[PDB]
Amino acid sequence: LLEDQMRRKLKFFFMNPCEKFWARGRKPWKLAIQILKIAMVTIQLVLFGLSNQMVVAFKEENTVAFKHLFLKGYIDRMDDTYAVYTQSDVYDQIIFAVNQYLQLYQVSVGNHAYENSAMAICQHFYKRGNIYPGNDTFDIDPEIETDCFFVEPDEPFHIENKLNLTLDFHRLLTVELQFKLKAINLQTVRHQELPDCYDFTLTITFDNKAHSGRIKISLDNDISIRECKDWHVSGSIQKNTHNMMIFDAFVILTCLVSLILCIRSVISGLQLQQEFVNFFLLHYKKDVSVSDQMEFVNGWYIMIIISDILTIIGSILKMEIQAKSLTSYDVCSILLGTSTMLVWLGVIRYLGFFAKYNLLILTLQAALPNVIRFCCCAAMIYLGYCFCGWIVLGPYHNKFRSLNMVSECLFSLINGDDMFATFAKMQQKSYLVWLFSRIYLYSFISLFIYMILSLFIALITDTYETIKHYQQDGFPETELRTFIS
Amino acid sequence: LLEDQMRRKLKFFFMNPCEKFWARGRKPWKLAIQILKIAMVTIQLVLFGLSNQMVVAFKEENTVAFKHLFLKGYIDRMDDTYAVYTQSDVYDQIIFAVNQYLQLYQVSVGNHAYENSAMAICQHFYKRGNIYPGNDTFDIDPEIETDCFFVEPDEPFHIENKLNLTLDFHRLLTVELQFKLKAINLQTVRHQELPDCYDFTLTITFDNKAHSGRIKISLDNDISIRECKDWHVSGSIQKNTHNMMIFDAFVILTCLVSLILCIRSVISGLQLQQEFVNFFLLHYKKDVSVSDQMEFVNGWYIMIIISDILTIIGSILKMEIQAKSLTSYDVCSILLGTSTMLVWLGVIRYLGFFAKYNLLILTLQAALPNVIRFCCCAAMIYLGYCFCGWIVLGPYHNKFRSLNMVSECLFSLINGDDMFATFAKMQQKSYLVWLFSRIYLYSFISLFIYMILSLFIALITDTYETIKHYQQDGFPETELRTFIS
Amino acid sequence: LLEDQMRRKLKFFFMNPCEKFWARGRKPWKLAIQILKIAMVTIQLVLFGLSNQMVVAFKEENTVAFKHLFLKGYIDRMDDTYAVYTQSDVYDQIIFAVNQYLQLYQVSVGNHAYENSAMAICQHFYKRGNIYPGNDTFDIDPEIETDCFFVEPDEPFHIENKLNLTLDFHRLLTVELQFKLKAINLQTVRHQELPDCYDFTLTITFDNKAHSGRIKISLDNDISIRECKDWHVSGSIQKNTHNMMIFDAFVILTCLVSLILCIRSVISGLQLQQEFVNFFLLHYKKDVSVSDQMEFVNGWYIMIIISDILTIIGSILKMEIQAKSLTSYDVCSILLGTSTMLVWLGVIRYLGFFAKYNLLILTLQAALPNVIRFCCCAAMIYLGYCFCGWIVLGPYHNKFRSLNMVSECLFSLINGDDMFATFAKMQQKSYLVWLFSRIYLYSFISLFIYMILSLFIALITDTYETIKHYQQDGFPETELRTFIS
Amino acid sequence: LLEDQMRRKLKFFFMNPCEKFWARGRKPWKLAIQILKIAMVTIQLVLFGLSNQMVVAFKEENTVAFKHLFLKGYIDRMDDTYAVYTQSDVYDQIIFAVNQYLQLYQVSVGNHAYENSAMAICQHFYKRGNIYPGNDTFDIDPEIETDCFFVEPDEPFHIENKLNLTLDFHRLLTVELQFKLKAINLQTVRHQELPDCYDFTLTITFDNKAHSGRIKISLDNDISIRECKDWHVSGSIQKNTHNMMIFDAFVILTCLVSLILCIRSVISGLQLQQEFVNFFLLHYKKDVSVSDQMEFVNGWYIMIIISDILTIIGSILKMEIQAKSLTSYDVCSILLGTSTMLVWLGVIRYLGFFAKYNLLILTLQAALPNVIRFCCCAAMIYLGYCFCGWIVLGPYHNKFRSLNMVSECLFSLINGDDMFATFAKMQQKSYLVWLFSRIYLYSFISLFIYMILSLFIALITDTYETIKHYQQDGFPETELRTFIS
Ligand SMILES: CC(C)CCC[C@@H](C)[C@H]1CC[C@H]2[C@@H]3CC=C4C[C@@H](OC(=O)CCC(=O)O)CC[C@]4(C)[C@H]3CC[C@]12C
Ligand SMILES: CC(C)CCC[C@@H](C)[C@H]1CC[C@H]2[C@@H]3CC=C4C[C@@H](OC(=O)CCC(=O)O)CC[C@]4(C)[C@H]3CC[C@]12C
Numbered sequence A, B, C, D: 001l002l003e004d005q006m007r008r009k010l011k012f013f014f015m016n017p018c019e020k021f022w023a024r025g026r027k028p029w030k031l032a033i034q035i036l037k038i039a040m041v042t043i044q045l046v047l048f049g050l051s052n053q054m055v056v057a058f059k060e061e062n063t064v065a066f067k068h069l070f071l072k073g074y075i076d077r078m079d080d081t082y083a084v085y086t087q088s089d090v091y092d093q094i095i096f097a098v099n100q101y102l103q104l105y106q107v108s109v110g111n112h113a114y115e116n117s118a119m120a121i122c123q124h125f126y127k128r129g130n131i132y133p134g135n136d137t138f139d140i141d142p143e144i145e146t147d148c149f150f151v152e153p154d155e156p157f158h159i160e161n162k163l164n165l166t167l168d169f170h171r172l173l174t175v176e177l178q179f180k181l182k183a184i185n186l187q188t189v190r191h192q193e194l195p196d197c198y199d200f201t202l203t204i205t206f207d208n209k210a211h212s213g214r215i216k217i218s219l220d221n222d223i224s225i226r227e228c229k230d231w232h233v234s235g236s237i238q239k240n241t242h243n244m245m246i247f248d249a250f251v252i253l254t255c256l257v258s259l260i261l262c263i264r265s266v267i268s269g270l271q272l273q274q275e276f277v278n279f280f281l282l283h284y285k286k287d288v289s290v291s292d293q294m295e296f297v298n299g300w301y302i303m304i305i306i307s308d309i310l311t312i313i314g315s316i317l318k319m320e321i322q323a324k325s326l327t328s329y330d331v332c333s334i335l336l337g338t339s340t341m342l343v344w345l346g347v348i349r350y351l352g353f354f355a356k357y358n359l360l361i362l363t364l365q366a367a368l369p370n371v372i373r374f375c376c377c378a379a380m381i382y383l384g385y386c387f388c389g390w391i392v393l394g395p396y397h398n399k400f401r402s403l404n405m406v407s408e409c410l411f412s413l414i415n416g417d418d419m420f421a422t423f424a425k426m427q428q429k430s431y432l433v434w435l436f437s438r439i440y441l442y443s444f445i446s447l448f449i450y451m452i453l454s455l456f457i458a459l460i461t462d463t464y465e466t467i468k469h470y471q472q473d474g475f476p477e478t479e480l481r482t483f484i485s
């Protein structure tokens, strides 16, 4: 009698939502609003990423240009950080950067101009440095001394050194050439949503840190977006317009509703759970069951909770940046990215309503724990090889310098990548270390490819075999499916 | 009695054609004409592709030469599109292209000459552009203004600027140097089927679009094939001859006959099908069978229908191009390519007449659906990682700029390609995004290699196991094989 | 009674040779002489290959040097065949080669000298060539005309052109600069077995074939080994000595003996075979057995026959070259290589005397046929993709030019190699062909990795399962093992 | 009665240590001290490797700088060994190195100075060399003659040759420019544990060995660490301090204790073993058992013995180098590396106390022997291809020069790496060898990927199947587990 009521409640909880409408006619609003969330957050990421793509492309093209203009002897990809080994070359390159700053209106191409105005030279060298290696002696004050100078851009008189730059090269940490420029992007006039002007704050670093007769040279531009006061097109006045704000607000609306409903379904599942527990204990003195208790919990909803939280936070920060017109898009990108990932996994929630898809996702879920355990063991062997190869082959190989590069290399070697370059880039300056490199790599690659990938394949193959055998000959006993039957 | 007649008809429909001649002596003409089609379309593709290969090789060698002649500072592979960052270099390179156009008879090597005659300079810049970034202001007319000029090739007077080219560089979209040249290929005199002369229409694009202080520079030659009026060899007059036309016509003949016969066999299969249905229902009141209805349909014939249609269309377009002597071979190549692919699959029709080959092809066919479903699921996870990596690691990685490049990268990572370059080409300018790159790549590569390829292997392994078990212990019940037995 | 005699003979034929000495004490001479052959042919290949390695290293270092001396603007690896696009550069490079030939005693380093004497210029251009592309007309005599000239090396007067070289560039096929030089290798004085002096016959080819405004440039040296008349060391007279000849003769001895004994064992196996047949038929009227007839044949001996023949032939040619002192080592290398390969497989004959090794080699042999059949089918699909990708993506991809390069690429893609470079090196000049490239590559790589490698793994896994089941539960019935039991 | 005592002893020996405290309350000190050893040796390797990393980085940056200063025309990565092909270039480069040595205080950047003083030129050429290749004759004295010279660094008079260097280039083996410099590292003042000053002993080798008109050029610096007499910071006197010594001593303490206890447990296991043997024989006349005898031996302890020995030796050598302040870290690195590897495997000892981990490690151990046997067979086939490809494709391929490079290549090809570059880097100068290259590579790659990796997967899959079946249906009979039960 009442047992029948419990069977009705439970089966109503275990039936698919599409099955909860063919039988009892409950309108599936939850599926609809989730689908809305999926397409919504997707479109959000797409538009936001296209905008970022245009802005970043503008920035990258610009900084490449500034490198080819201000840095002498720059080559595409010299790690984007070439070095100089001679005093006269340091002087020639500083002079090159300055003279190319003062002729920027005559030599360059783009829409570049000045802050409207100074070019900041900045020496950074030790307060007291007296180094005598020929006598095996030195006296240092690690506290830092600074010097500076400003060239007004309207001074074409000086352009046989002219400016008063003089160096020591015994006490020196870095020279910095700091200045600022302004430009405009013209692909963005077609889209009012983007600010048009852009501020560039450039610094050229001549780094003599890590004294080795090798001065690193780098350029870095830290930028600032700005909204123009006004801008015309064919006589028509125009200012920047915002409509993405309302879109993001509607994202927060949708994800908030989904959050509320999902929490309601979780709490309902827990109340129904304890109801089952207390009812089952009371009626027949039997209730030491834990797996069924988990079966009432549904991790997918939890995935949607984490997803909704991350979408809301990322959207608030997004609105903040589009309002203040900042250019630092790093946290929102990650929150929204992870969110989307979890959302599409939600669609994999919306493929398990088929028994064959159900077979496959259940195979994956059932396999995951044993795979993680075995990844612990193989991770232990992996760590062993990582320390060993790091300490032994660090000095004699381009890789293996840092433990991270080690892990990257060994991982790639498990997955076939870049073997002959590893065998070949080794130095034969020491023969014993070279032999050990060989035993290390043959033993490693053989052990992890020929024995262990094989065992992963054995695991997933075995789980597929079992759950196939369950969809043939029935699941194992649970005492809940018995009660439903 | 009549059931025996049905067994005779059906078994006559289920027996192999080689088996339909050892028993009843029906001459297999269909196999013969299909084989003729196979070798025919193959030889077609080979000859057509060799011709295209010669023409394309001539074009490519030529355009490489024109790049090294007219473009200053060209390097093999600077993406075939090098850039310039300075006004004086733009002037020097325009001047280089012009002076190398006017000295082309004295400096070059090949058989180059002129249209018999103008060198077209063409500026393309805004009608009204007034850009003041120093004041955060600009006024634009996005409508385009054009200017032009023509240098007669017989003007060696001008060769300290001489021509009247002057630029603004604030309003500018592109400069175009358009001209035309004529040449002859001499490997083709040995083959009358090919036209000998070739027209080249060259354009040099100095692109200042996407204003970033970086002017793209490209060369493009759009060509036109031409038949010479006449051409001699050792005193013997010769003009171009065509025999490939008859060949293509015979292709259309063969494929048309195959099309007709195959459609006849499909329609016969459908009439025999409904005959079986109505007969089986009428006799014993049993006919709710759908799998047997499909078993009367044979998809291979359909493959041959699509194949024949594509061969006929591609051959008509082929004859059209060889008649009009055009140089645009893109649609015919694809129709004929896909056609051939389907034809060789037809030969795989002509390997299933052996029970072991039959075991293997049946294994593949039986496995394909479940593989496509699982490719749907894993495609969902794949899309998640694609969006996430796109938005997060777009700005800080050379890959990941566009979703397509993302999908290409992740696909390559599933199949082992180019890992250490992905781990290594990342920028450490932001540490949090870098960590996230690591979790992203380790988690991704591990998840798709160590768990999912394994599951594909489990699927095909399982299907091989089953159908092996069927060729041992017999197929499952169908109620058609029962009637035949 | 007599059946027992047959059991004794047969079991004596089926027992291992080490088992034929523990029981009946037959001295295994065959194993000993085969082992002798293994180590013998191995040592042969090693010494012969080390010698070749020294000679080839000398040649390669030399030709690299001659490239850097005589070819202007040579770069390491410009495909070893750089091109020139300008007349004046052709003149400058010819002049460079000549002047660097006449100053070779003053500019160079090594032990270079002359034939003791001419530098051969050789033009090769059409007899009659009159090409007018501006009028779409041309008259040709494809017969070839030649001109020549000789610069005596002792003419420093000429060194503003001096020599009388003049070109047309409309009729021209190739210019050839042919000459000869002599040198000595000094690593070989330490080894009397090698001739010390070396002759180099150099030709520089300026190839204007395939008229495209691009003249290929290559250097080729065809060499000739020579034995010096005499050579001293510290006052001691020395001439080249040969002892490798006797070694090779002893190789021919060993391999000949093995050949004889193996043929004797094959013929004995055939006589014993027909004896079994006739005896089995005569006694019980039962003899329609073919598998047992094969079981008396042993393919390993055949492998040793082919091996011995190839070792003898390669050794005769080897002795011929060491006698005549030629430098063409291409056929002997291949005969000896294949021979050695088959010999080490012979050692795999000498590992099947263990039941576990026996399990594995039997697994491999039992799997091979079905693998070859399935490689036929998958080869058909492979050919389809090869033709399609060849014709479609030939013009728009650096690969896919020739069917061989296609097969190499697709093979590499099956085995994971070089994906992102294939996706990325495609040209977006045509969007439809680009899309088709994508469907082509995703479909291909997915089909051959995710479904077919899986099936190979299923095959070998299945065979291992079966033969495991036979070493557990006994082999199947043969009616020969029944008679032995 | 007494059998019960034996069951108690044995089960006390077979129970886990954590199980030997939940039941009988034996304090597990061994686990604690081993864990201490794990973290200890780990931290040791980390600190030691970071120090080495700083020192090696300093050295590498330095030698790169010296290359760019003293070697003319040096390029990043010209194999770090560029060559010269002309006399005048040899003179120009020697002159460059000398003049850049004498201006080192004016041209360079770092903290470089002199020994306080000579620049050593050293010719090495034959005593008697008279080579006449034009007459096919030569007379040699392979004994070596040497010449030398010293330029005082304080001689700016000479800087139109000035120094008296003259060469022959017919008799010559090598020129050596040897000198010494002193420098200081400043990242190390922050760490008193490291000596600050560094000695560099530089040699430039112009190698004319292997006479081929190609002089190799290399730079090599052999260094010597030195402790400065004193060094100040902001007026505070400072000398180098050592605390790592005590740490290493405590390593030796821990590993020694572990060594002692482990040997005690092994010997106890052997005494208990023979006790079981003699007792089992005496009581029931049954004792021909060998597997149980091994089951009393535990290889993990042995792994810890080898580990402890290697840690102690490496630590003694470590203390020796930190005391004497040497810079040769090659043996200690390897001993400590292998040690750590074995230690983390020890942690895999500390994961087998779980039955699922136990399933996996037992799967791996049970699979290893058959994998090694099959690696013997496949190694035989591998050797065959190695010899064949070595001798045939040595001269015509960049790889395949040496047998080691062969093995590296073929190994990479088994694991997918670098196929299209192997197919493509072959020379078509000989067509037969090229075809053979194709059959070689297709046959090889197909045979080892499509058939043999498959069989490894079959092996590990089979072992997983079996031991799964044992943890389901119980282990096989041993007659020891019977006695315990
Ligand atoms: C191969 C499959 C079966 C499992 C592989 C496991 C890896 C994905 C994980 C497991 C633990 C990780 C390691 C845990 C800790 C570190 C220390 C970490 O230290 C550093 O930051 C290096 C520089 C420094 O020492 O400061 C470097 C990465 C590394 C080796 C990690 C690299 C990646 C590892 C090996
Ligand atoms: C990994 C195996 C198990 C299945 C992987 C599936 C892929 C072969 C397919 C399935 C769906 C495809 C995606 C469907 C839609 C798009 C959007 C498409 O959008 C663009 O054109 C990018 C530029 C733009 O946004 O305009 C980019 C390719 C992409 C990600 C496709 C890439 C290739 C995908 C992921």
Ligand SMILES: CC(C)CCC[C@@H](C)[C@H]1CC[C@H]2[C@@H]3CC=C4C[C@@H](OC(=O)CCC(=O)O)CC[C@]4(C)[C@H]3CC[C@]12C
Pocket: C374, C375, C376, C378, C379, C382, C383, C386, C402, C403, C404, C407, C414, D442
């Ligand atoms: C992928 C596995 C399952 C089987 C793959 C089979 C390949 C190892 C073989 C089978 C047949 C071979 C093909 C047979 C014939 C030719 C024609 C041959 O024609 C040429 O010589 C190209 C130049 C010309 O047309 O003259 C090019 C190689 C090719 C495609 C071969 C390439 C290598 C193939 C595809």
Ligand code: NA
Pocket: A415, A416, A417, B415, B416, B417, C415, C416, C417, D415, D416, D417
């Ligand atoms: Na790979």
Ligand code: NA
Pocket: A415, A416, B415, B416, C415, C416, D415, D416
């Ligand atoms: Na792989």
Ligand code: NA
Pocket: A415, A416, A417, A418, B415, B416, B417, B418, C415, C416, C417, C418, D415, D416, D417, D418
């Ligand atoms: Na790879």
